[PDB]
Chain A
Amino acid sequence: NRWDETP
């Protein structure tokens, strides 16, 4: 999933 993905 995209949770907690930083730049």
Chain B
Amino acid sequence: MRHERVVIIKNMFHPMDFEDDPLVLNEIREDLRVECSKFGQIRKLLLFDRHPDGVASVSFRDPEEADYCIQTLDGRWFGGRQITAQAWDGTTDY
């Protein structure tokens, strides 16, 4: 084999963030899409908005694009949280 194109990003939010502002979810989604567009063609972008670990997945067209994304985002700060970015393990669901 698998040449991984999917990036799993964590700690981007906590689901309570969307409890009292119905606009934050779409703002975070767009923030991520705009940034990730610089790394490669996005095939699919998902926010797991009820996952307690603040998870998003970004699928790219090429594995090099996923690599560039992981290199740039892992350990970066987002909205006051330090995020992780890693290649999908191919098994875990969110």
**Which residues from chain A sit less than 8 Å from chain B, CB to CB?**
1-7
**Which residues from chain B sit less than 8 Å from chain A, CB to CB?**
28, 31, 34-35, 76-80
Instruction: Give the interface SS of chain B, mostly helix, strand, loop or mixed.
Output: mixed
The answer to whether B77 touches A4 (Cβ under 8 A) is yes
Given that A1-B35, A2-B28, A2-B31 are contacting pairs, would A7 and B76 also be in contact in the complex, using a CB cutoff of 8 Å?
no
Minimal beta-carbon separation of A1 from chain B (angstroms): 5
The answer to whether B76 touches A3 (Cβ under 8 A) is yes
Interface centre among A1, A4, A7, by most chain B C-beta atoms within 10 angstroms, is A1
The answer to whether B31 touches A5 (Cβ under 8 A) is no
Query: In the complex, which residue of chain B has the Cβ closest to the Cβ of A2?
Result: B79
